[PDB]
Amino acid sequence: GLFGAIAGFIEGGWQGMVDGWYGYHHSNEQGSGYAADKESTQKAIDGVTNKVNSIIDKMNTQFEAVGREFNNLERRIENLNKKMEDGFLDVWTYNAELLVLMENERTLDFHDSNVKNLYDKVRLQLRDNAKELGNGCFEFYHKCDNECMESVRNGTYDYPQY
Amino acid sequence: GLFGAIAGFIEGGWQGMVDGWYGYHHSNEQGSGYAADKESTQKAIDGVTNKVNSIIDKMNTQFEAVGREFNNLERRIENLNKKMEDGFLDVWTYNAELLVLMENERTLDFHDSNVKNLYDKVRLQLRDNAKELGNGCFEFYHKCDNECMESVRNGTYDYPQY
Amino acid sequence: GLFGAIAGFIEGGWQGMVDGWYGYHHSNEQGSGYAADKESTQKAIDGVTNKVNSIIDKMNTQFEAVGREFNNLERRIENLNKKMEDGFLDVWTYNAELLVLMENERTLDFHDSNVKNLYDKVRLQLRDNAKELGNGCFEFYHKCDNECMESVRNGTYDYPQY
Amino acid sequence: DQICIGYHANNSTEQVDTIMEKNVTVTHAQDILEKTHNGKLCDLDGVKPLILRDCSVAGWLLGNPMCDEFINVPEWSYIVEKANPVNDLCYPGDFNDYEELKHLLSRINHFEKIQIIPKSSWSSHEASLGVSSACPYQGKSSFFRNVVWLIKKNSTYPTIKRSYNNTNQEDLLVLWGIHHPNDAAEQTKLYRNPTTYISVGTSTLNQRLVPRIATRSKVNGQNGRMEFFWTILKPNDAINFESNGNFIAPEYAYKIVKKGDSTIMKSELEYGNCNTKCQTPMGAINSSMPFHNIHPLTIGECPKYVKSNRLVLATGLRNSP
Amino acid sequence: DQICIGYHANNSTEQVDTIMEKNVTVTHAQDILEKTHNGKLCDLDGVKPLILRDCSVAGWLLGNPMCDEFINVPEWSYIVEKANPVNDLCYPGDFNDYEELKHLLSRINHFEKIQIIPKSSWSSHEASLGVSSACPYQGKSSFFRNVVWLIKKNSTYPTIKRSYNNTNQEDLLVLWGIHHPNDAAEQTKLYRNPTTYISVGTSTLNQRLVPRIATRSKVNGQNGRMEFFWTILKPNDAINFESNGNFIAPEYAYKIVKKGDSTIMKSELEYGNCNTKCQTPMGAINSSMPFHNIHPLTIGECPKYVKSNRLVLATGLRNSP
Amino acid sequence: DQICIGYHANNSTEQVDTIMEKNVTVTHAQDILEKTHNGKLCDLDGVKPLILRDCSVAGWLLGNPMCDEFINVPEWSYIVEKANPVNDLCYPGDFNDYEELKHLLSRINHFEKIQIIPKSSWSSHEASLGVSSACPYQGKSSFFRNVVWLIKKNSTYPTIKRSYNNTNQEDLLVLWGIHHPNDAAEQTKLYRNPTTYISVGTSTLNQRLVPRIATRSKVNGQNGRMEFFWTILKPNDAINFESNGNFIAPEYAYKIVKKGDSTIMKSELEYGNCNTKCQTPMGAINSSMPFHNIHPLTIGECPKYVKSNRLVLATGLRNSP
C-alpha cells in the first residue's frame, strides 16, 4: 500500500489480536501477548463509519423511473422516453460503482497510514534506547518488564530513565 | 491525517507564524522566533489555487433548464420534461457536492504531506548532530547561533563542521 | 509529490537506468552501475495496467445518441430531445475528464510512494552500518564489494556481519 | 525483550475491488446492494393493489361484461395490468387519448361510480337492444355496462338533448362513444337518419363527432367500430349532449374521491397474499440496503436502483494469508 | 538550543466537510455557492423585459382591449407572465397551438405591428358591430383589437375572397379566428348562410375550418366560442382567405424584426426598476461565484444552479484549538 | 562505497494534466481519445449504405421519377440523406406522419417492392393521364411511379371499391394519397362528382378523407396539393379502398423482409468507396481507443463520444529535466 506498513515492512497481520485493528505485541521474561491501541482503532472506526454514511446519503437523491405509455404513432417520443430513463440509470450505475472503487482504495490506504503512524509514534519515543529490527519490532537494550511495556503503550516511556 | 504530522507528532499549529503556512521556530541564547519556509508555502499556494480553478472550470459546461409549456392533454410529455430537467439537476448537484468532499479531504492531506516533508528535509540534514525530540523539534548537541539556524533553513547546514 | 521522494530528497531520475522504473545505483573500487528492482517495478506495471483497464471498462456502458426528426409544429419536443442528448454528452464528458485528472494525480503519487518504500526498505536493512547522506544514497562504513551490494538488493544484507 | 507494532487478521474471505487491484481479501466489508425479492405482488403498506387480471383499464372503465369483478373496486395502492390483456374492447374500435387517461390514473387511488343518466330515462329511444355477440355474458349478447347503445324506437330517432350538471364536490370522469356503422343500409337499419352527429359541450369542451362509413375487416366477428371519448367534468360545470343517431350514451360515471401517489405496473404475476413497503413488477423488497438491482420501476419507500451485479465496500483492512 | 518545524494557526472558525469527517475547522476556506438575490425583476444588460402584468401572451397578441398598455411594445430582453393572468381570452374559446407559439417567442426580442387588411376595406360586410359584453372597454362592449369580427350587411354575407402578399423582408405572424355560434338560429341571425366555412392557404398551409354548433356552458356570460389560429407567412409568400361566414379576419399582424435569445418567465413579481446581468423568476443575481441555488430557470451570464445548501472548499489547513 | 535508490528518466516530452498542476512531463503516457477519421461514407461491415443523393425518403418511397436510381434498392446497413434534398415531393403537398415513418426505417434494412393493384386493372377509370409538369421525366410530364392518379373516363367517375389482402408472410407498407383541387371547376373537370371522399379500412384503420378546396400559392408551378398517407398492413389482414374521386391509388407497395439496426444519417458527403466497422456523418473510424470526439451520431462498434480535445493518462512517472 501507499504507506509501506501493511503487507510491507510489517509482513502480515495477527490472528491473535482480536480486540482491535491496530496494536502491540510484547515479549520479555515474564511472557508475551497482544494489546490493541484503542485510540487509533477508534479513530479508524469513526472515519470508516462516517464514510459509509456519506456514501449512502450522497446517493440518497437519485433518479427514479416512472411508467409512461405511448400509442403506435408516438414511436419517437416513446423512444426518447426510453433513452432518457436508460441514460440516467447508466449515469447513476457509473457513479455508484466508481465511488465504491475509489473509496475502497482509499479505505485500505487509510488503514496502512494508521499502522505506519502508530509505528512512528513508538519509534519517536524509543529513539536510540532500542534497536529498530526492520519488521515492525524494536528490541530493547535494557530489560523491559510489563510496567515498562505499558509505558511504551502509554506514550509515557521515560527515555532519560533508560 | 494520512501523513502523521499535522495534529499528529506535531500537536498543534502556531498562532505566532503569520507570514506562511509552514516554517521554523528556533530558540537559543540570543532569543527565539518564527520563520516561514517560503518555497513549500508557495508550492502549497500554487497547488490549491490551481485546484480551485480546476474545480470551477470543470463545472463550467453543465446542464441549463429552459421553460417549456404543455396543454392539458400533453400530461405525459410535460412529466417527461420535468423528470428530465430534475434528473440532470440531481446529477450535477451530486457531482458538485462529492467533488468538494473528495477534494477537501485531499487538500487537508496535502498540507499534512508538505509539513512532514519539510520535517524530513531538516531531519536528513541534521542527522546525528541533534536529538530528535519526537514533537517536531530537534535539540542540538552544539550551540547553534542565528547564523547556524539560518543555515538549517537554507539547506546549507554544514554537517561535518559540527 | 505527497511522499517526498521523487523530485524531493531524490532530486532527479536516471537516464542510465533503462531496465526498470525504480532501482539501485552502486559505486565502489570495482566500479559502478544501475540495477532495476524487479519486484517493485512489476507491482507498478500491474497497478497501472489494471487502472487503465478499469477506467476503460467503467466508461464502457455510456450514453449513445440516436437520430430523431420532428416537423415544424413539434418545436418543443425537438428542443427537449436536443437538451436531453446534449445534457448526457456533457455529463459523460465531465466524468471522463475528471476521472483522468484525478487518476493521473494518483498515478504520479503511486510512483513516489513506491520509490519512498524502496528507500525505506534499504534504510531498515542497513540501519547504523551506513551513513544516510540525505539524497537517496547510503555511504558504507565498511568496504562493500559487488557481492555485498547484491545482498543489499537481495534483502539479505547481513547486518551483524558488518 | 521487544515490542512490536502490528495489525488485525482473521479468517475472512470477503473480497473488495479497487482501481488498481481486484478481489482483495479484507477482514471486514459491507454489502450495500439488495439482490433478492420475494417474487410476489403484495399489499403496499396495508393497502391492496387493483389487480385487473385479464381485464385492461379500458375493459374496466367502460365496463366490459367480462370484468364484473371490478364493477365497484375499493381504494387501491397501485394497479397491475398485464402486457396483453384478453378482455380489452370486446366490440372492436378505439379509445381516444387512452394514454393520457392512464397517466391521469397514476394520480388516482379511488373512484366511486355513480349514475348520471338512468337507463330507464330513454322514453323516445330503445335502450335495451344495444347489444352484440362480440361482448357475450352468460351465453347471451351483452355490452359495455357503463354506456348505453341507443337505437330507434318505432322507426324514429328524434334528436336527443340531455344535460348533466356536476353538483358533486369531486371532479367527475365521464365516458361516452360513437358507433361507426358498416354501410349506408346499416345506418338506416339502426338509426334511420342517414346523416347523424353527436355534439358534446362543457365550459371547456366543444366537440362534434360524425360517424365514418368504411369497409372494415371483421374483428371479434364485427365489422362495425366503436370510438370512445372522455372528459373530466369539473365541479359546478355541466356536460351537454345533442345527437340524432350513433350515440353511445353515459349511464354511469366515476367520481374522483382520492388523489395521490399511484402507478400502473406491467406484470403477468398474480396476488401474492402478502404485505410490503416497497414493490416491483417482479416482486416485493424488504431490506435496509441503500441500493438494489431488481427492477427500475418501483413504488413505496425503496432503495435506489442500479444495474450492478455487486457493490461491496471495504471497512476493515487487507487480510493476511 | 533547538529548531522546530510547525504550521500555521489562526482565529478562524470556518468549517469544511470531508468524506470521513464533518465540520472540520480550517485556517482558510472559499465559499463557491451564491445564496442571495435582490428579489426584483430587472433590466437585463440595459434592455428592459416585457412585463405583461395581468395580461397573457394571447390577450397581448390578439389585442384584448384590457391590454392596451402593450399595443406597441418596444424590444425586450425577456418576458414575464403570471401563472394565472386574469386578462386572457375575454371572449371564451381556444388558441390553437398556443404552446408552440409561446415556444417561438423564446427566439424573439421584438415585434413591429403593421396593418394588412384595413378595417374600412369591408364594404360588403359590417365590420363595426363585431363586439361583445365579455370584452368591455370603458363601460362599452368591445373586442380583440387586432382581428375583425365580420357580420352580414343588409341581410347578406356574400363570399369573401381577400389575399395579402408579404412584400416585407421579415417573416410575418398572422392571426385569425372562427366563431362558433350557439344554435342554428344564431348562425342565420349573424351570418344568414346556414352552412359556412373558412379556407386559408399559403405556400405550405392548406386549411378549411367549419363552425361547430353545440350547447355550451356560459363562460364570461357567453355561450359562443372563438377558436384562434395562426401561421408564419414567409417573405414573398401570400395568404389567401375565402369564407362565407363565421370569419374573424386579420386587421393587424406582427413583423418579426429581431430574433435571438429570450424567455417567457413565470413570476408574480413586478418591475424592480433595476439592472442586472443574470435574472431569475425570484430575483436578480450579482456575484462571481461559480454556483448558485436561487432558481433553475435563469437568463443571462449566470453561475450554475445546484440544489445545495452549502458548498465550501478548504484552501488552508486544519486549524488548532 | 555507496548504494543509492533512484528512479527512471528518459527523453520523453509527453505531458499530462492533474487537479493541482497542468502540463506535467512524464516518462510514459497513454492517449485514449481518437481524434481522426477518414472523411468518407463507407460500407459498414461489408454492407453498403443506401445513399439517397439528391432524393429524400419521400421521393424514394413514393417513387419520384427523378429517383429511378432507387427503384429497387438492395439491403442496406444505414441510409444517408442530405439536409435539403432537391427531389422531394415534385408535386407540392404533405406527407402525413412522415417523421413516424422515418423512425420506422431505423428498424429496417431491406424492402422488396411488389405490385398490389395493377395499373391496367382500372377499366372504369382513366389511369394513364394522371401526370403533371411539376414531375417531369425526359422532357415530358410524369408522376410518382408507385401510385396511380386516377381521373374520369367518358365523363364518369363511378364509385371505386377495391380490396387487397396481405397473403405474404411479411408486414406490408402501403402508400396512397388524396388530391386537393384548386377550385369548384377543377373538381368537376377531373372527377365530375362535386362532393367526393376516400374511405380506407383495415383491422385497425378507420379513415375517411375529404378534399379541401382553397386558394393556394403556386409551388413548382402548381396550385393543387397532394396529401400522402400510409399504414402497415399486417399479415392476413386486408386493406379496403372506397372512393368517388380525388383518389391517388396504390400501384406498388414495399414488403418489410429484413428488420434490425439501422439509421438515417444526415450528410452532404457522397460514397467513399470504402469499408469500416464504425461510421459517422463526417467520416469513418478505425481505432482501438475507448473514446473519440468526431461526432455523436455513430453506427457500428464504436468508441464512446466525448466533447474533449484531449484525454491522456499518465502511466509512467514525473520525468526529469
Ligand SMILES: *[C@@H]1O[C@H](CO)[C@@H](O[C@@H]2O[C@H](CO)[C@@H](O[C@H]3O[C@H](CO[C@H]4O[C@H](CO)[C@@H](O)[C@H](O)[C@@H]4O)[C@@H](O)[C@H](O[C@@H]4O[C@H](CO)[C@@H](O)[C@H](O)[C@@H]4O)[C@@H]3O)[C@H](O)[C@H]2NC(C)=O)[C@H](O)[C@H]1NC(C)=O
Ligand atoms: C349547475 O347547478 C348548480 C347548482 O344547482 C349551479 O350553481 C348555482 O348557480 C346559480 C346561478 O345560476 C347560483 O345562484 C345564485 O348564486 C349567488 C349566490 O351568491 C352568494 O350567496 C350564497 C348564499 O350564501 C353563497 O353560498 C355564495 O357563495 C355567494 O357568496 C346569488 O347571489 C345569485 O344571485 C345574484 O344576486 C346578485 C345581487 O342580488 C346579483 O348582482 C347577481 O347578478 C345574481 O343575480 C344567484 O341567484 C348558485 O349560487 C349556484 N350554486 C352554488 C352552490 O354556487 C350551476 O350554475 C349549474 N351549472 C351550470 C353550467 O348551469
Ligand SMILES: *[C@@H]1O[C@H](CO)[C@@H](O[C@@H]2O[C@H](CO)[C@@H](O[C@H]3O[C@H](CO[C@H]4O[C@H](CO)[C@@H](O)[C@H](O)[C@@H]4O)[C@@H](O)[C@H](O[C@@H]4O[C@H](CO)[C@@H](O)[C@H](O)[C@@H]4O)[C@@H]3O)[C@H](O)[C@H]2NC(C)=O)[C@H](O)[C@H]1NC(C)=O
Ligand atoms: C407577392 O408579390 C411579390 C412582389 O410584388 C411577387 O414577387 C415577384 O414575382 C414576380 C413573378 O410573379 C417576379 O417577376 C419577375 O421576376 C424575374 C426577375 O428576374 C431577375 O431580375 C430581377 C431584376 O434585377 C432580379 O431582382 C431578380 O432577382 C432576378 O434575378 C423576371 O425575370 C420574371 O420574368 C421572367 O423572364 C424570363 C426571361 O425573360 C423568363 O424565362 C421567366 O419565365 C419569367 O417570365 C418576372 O417577370 C418578381 O421578380 C418578384 N419580385 C421579387 C422582388 O422577387 C410575389 O411573386 C408575390 N407572391 C405571390 C404568391 O404571388
Ligand SMILES: *[C@@H]1O[C@H](CO)[C@@H](O[C@@H]2O[C@H](CO)[C@@H](O[C@H]3O[C@H](CO[C@H]4O[C@H](CO)[C@@H](O)[C@H](O)[C@@H]4O)[C@@H](O)[C@H](O[C@@H]4O[C@H](CO)[C@@H](O)[C@H](O)[C@@H]4O)[C@@H]3O)[C@H](O)[C@H]2NC(C)=O)[C@H](O)[C@H]1NC(C)=O
Ligand atoms: C385474406 O386471405 C386469407 C387467405 O386467402 C384469409 O385467411 C383464411 O381465412 C379463412 C377464413 O375466412 C380460413 O379458412 C378456414 O380456416 C380454418 C383452418 O383451421 C385449421 O386448419 C388449417 C389446415 O391445416 C390450419 O392451417 C389452421 O392453422 C387451423 O389450425 C378452418 O378450420 C375454418 O373452418 C372452420 O371450421 C370449424 C370446424 O369445422 C368451425 O368451427 C369454424 O367456425 C370454421 O368454419 C376456415 O374454413 C383460412 O384458414 C385462412 N387462411 C390461413 C392461412 O390462415 C384471410 O382471412 C383473409 N383476410 C380477410 C380480412 O378476409
Ligand SMILES: *[C@H]1O[C@H](CO)[C@@H](O[C@@H]2O[C@H](CO)[C@@H](O[C@@H]3O[C@H](CO)[C@@H](O)[C@H](O)[C@@H]3O)[C@H](O)[C@H]2NC(C)=O)[C@H](O)[C@H]1NC(C)=O
Ligand atoms: C501508564 O503506565 C505507567 C507504567 O505502568 C504508569 O505508571 C505507574 O502507575 C501506577 C498506577 O497508577 C503506579 O502505581 C502506584 O504506586 C504508588 C507507589 O509506588 C502507590 O502509592 C499507588 O497506590 C499506585 O499503586 C506506579 O507508581 C507507576 N509506575 C511507574 C513505573 O511509573 C502511569 O501512571 C500510566 N500513565 C498513563 C497516562 O496511563
Ligand SMILES: *[C@H]1O[C@H](CO)[C@@H](O[C@@H]2O[C@H](CO)[C@@H](O[C@@H]3O[C@H](CO)[C@@H](O)[C@H](O)[C@@H]3O)[C@H](O)[C@H]2NC(C)=O)[C@H](O)[C@H]1NC(C)=O
Ligand atoms: C545561508 O545562510 C548562511 C549562514 O547564515 C550563509 O552564509 C553566510 O553568508 C553571509 C552573507 O553572504 C556571509 O557574510 C560574508 O562574510 C564575508 C567574510 O566573513 C564578507 O566578506 C562578506 O561581505 C559577507 O559579509 C558569511 O560569511 C556566511 N556565514 C557562514 C557561517 O557561512 C549563506 O550564504 C546562505 N546561503 C544561501 C544559499 O542562502
Ligand SMILES: *[C@H]1O[C@H](CO)[C@@H](O[C@@H]2O[C@H](CO)[C@@H](O[C@@H]3O[C@H](CO)[C@@H](O)[C@H](O)[C@@H]3O)[C@H](O)[C@H]2NC(C)=O)[C@H](O)[C@H]1NC(C)=O
Ligand atoms: C543474494 O546474494 C547473495 C550475495 O551475493 C547470495 O549469496 C551468495 O550466493 C552465491 C550463489 O549461490 C554463493 O556461491 C556459492 O559458493 C559456494 C562456496 O563458497 C559454492 O559451493 C557454490 O557452488 C556457489 O558458488 C555464495 O556463497 C554466496 N555469498 C555470500 C557472501 O553469501 C545469496 O545466495 C543471494 N540470495 C538471494 C535470496 O537471492
Ligand SMILES: CC(=O)N[C@H]1[C@H]([C@H](O)[C@H](O)CO)O[C@@](O[C@@H]2[C@@H](O)[C@H](O)O[C@H](CO)[C@@H]2O)(C(=O)O)C[C@@H]1O
Ligand atoms: C344494436 C344492434 O344493432 N345490434 C346488432 C349488431 C349491430 O347491428 C352491428 O354489430 C352493428 O355494426 O349486430 C349483431 O349481428 C351481427 C351482424 O350484424 C353481422 O352481419 O354478422 C355478425 C356475425 O359475426 C352478427 O350476427 C351482433 O353484433 O351480434 C346483432 C346485434 O343485435
Ligand SMILES: CC(=O)N[C@H]1[C@H]([C@H](O)[C@H](O)CO)O[C@@](O[C@@H]2[C@@H](O)[C@H](O)O[C@H](CO)[C@@H]2O)(C(=O)O)C[C@@H]1O
Ligand atoms: C356581433 C354580435 O353578434 N354581437 C352580439 C353577441 C353575439 O351575438 C353572441 O355573443 C354570439 O355568440 O351577443 C351579445 O349579447 C349576448 C346574448 O347573445 C346572450 O344571449 O346573452 C348575453 C348576456 O350574457 C349577451 O347579451 C354580447 O356578446 O353581449 C350582443 C352582441 O352585440
Ligand SMILES: CC(=O)N[C@H]1[C@H]([C@H](O)[C@H](O)CO)O[C@@](O[C@@H]2[C@@H](O)[C@H](O)O[C@H](CO)[C@@H]2O)(C(=O)O)C[C@@H]1O
Ligand atoms: C391529371 C391532370 O389533371 N393533369 C393536369 C394537371 C392538373 O389538372 C392540375 O395540376 C390539378 O391541380 O395540370 C396540368 O396543367 C397545369 C394547369 O392546370 C395550371 O393552370 O397551370 C400549370 C402551369 O404552371 C399547368 O399547365 C399540369 O400539371 O401540368 C396539366 C395536367 O395534364
Ligand SMILES: *[C@@H]1O[C@H](CO)[C@@H](O[C@@H]2O[C@H](CO)[C@@H](O)[C@H](O)[C@H]2NC(C)=O)[C@H](O)[C@H]1NC(C)=O
Ligand atoms: C475475481 O473473482 C470473481 C469471483 O470469483 C471472478 O469471477 C469468476 O470468474 C471466473 C473465471 O475466473 C468465471 O468462470 C466465473 O463466472 C466468475 N464467477 C463469478 C461468481 O462471478 C473473477 O474472475 C475474478 N476477477 C479477477 C480479475 O481475478
Ligand SMILES: *[C@@H]1O[C@H](CO)[C@@H](O[C@@H]2O[C@H](CO)[C@@H](O)[C@H](O)[C@H]2NC(C)=O)[C@H](O)[C@H]1NC(C)=O
Ligand atoms: C455540523 O455543523 C452544522 C452547523 O452548525 C450542524 O447543523 C446544525 O445541527 C443542529 C443540531 O446539531 C441543528 O439543530 C441545526 O438546525 C443545524 N444548523 C444549521 C445552521 O444547519 C450539524 O449538525 C453539524 N454536523 C455534524 C455531523 O456534527
Ligand SMILES: *[C@@H]1O[C@H](CO)[C@@H](O[C@@H]2O[C@H](CO)[C@@H](O)[C@H](O)[C@H]2NC(C)=O)[C@H](O)[C@H]1NC(C)=O
Ligand atoms: C499547457 O500546454 C498547452 C499546449 O502547449 C498550452 O496550450 C497552448 O497555450 C498557448 C498559450 O500559452 C496558446 O497560444 C495555444 O493555442 C495553446 N496550444 C495548444 C496546442 O493548445 C497551455 O497554455 C498550457 N497550459 C498551462 C496552464 O500552462
Ligand SMILES: *[C@@H]1O[C@H](CO)[C@@H](O)[C@H](O)[C@H]1NC(C)=O
Ligand atoms: C471464523 O472464526 C470465527 C471466530 O470468530 C468462528 O466463529 C467461525 O466459525 C470461523 N469460520 C471459519 C469458516 O473458519
Ligand SMILES: *[C@@H]1O[C@H](CO)[C@@H](O)[C@H](O)[C@H]1NC(C)=O
Ligand atoms: C424483513 O427482513 C428482516 C431481515 O433483515 C426480517 O427481520 C423481517 O422478517 C422482515 N420484515 C418484514 C416486515 O417483513
Ligand SMILES: *[C@@H]1O[C@H](CO)[C@@H](O)[C@H](O)[C@H]1NC(C)=O
Ligand atoms: C482575528 O484576528 C484578526 C487578526 O488578523 C483580527 O483582525 C480579527 O479581529 C480577529 N477576529 C476575532 C473574532 O478574534
Ligand SMILES: *[C@@H]1O[C@H](CO)[C@@H](O)[C@H](O)[C@H]1NC(C)=O
Ligand atoms: C455586485 O456586487 C459587488 C460585491 O461583490 C459590488 O461591488 C457591486 O455593488 C455590485 N455590482 C453591480 C453592477 O451591481
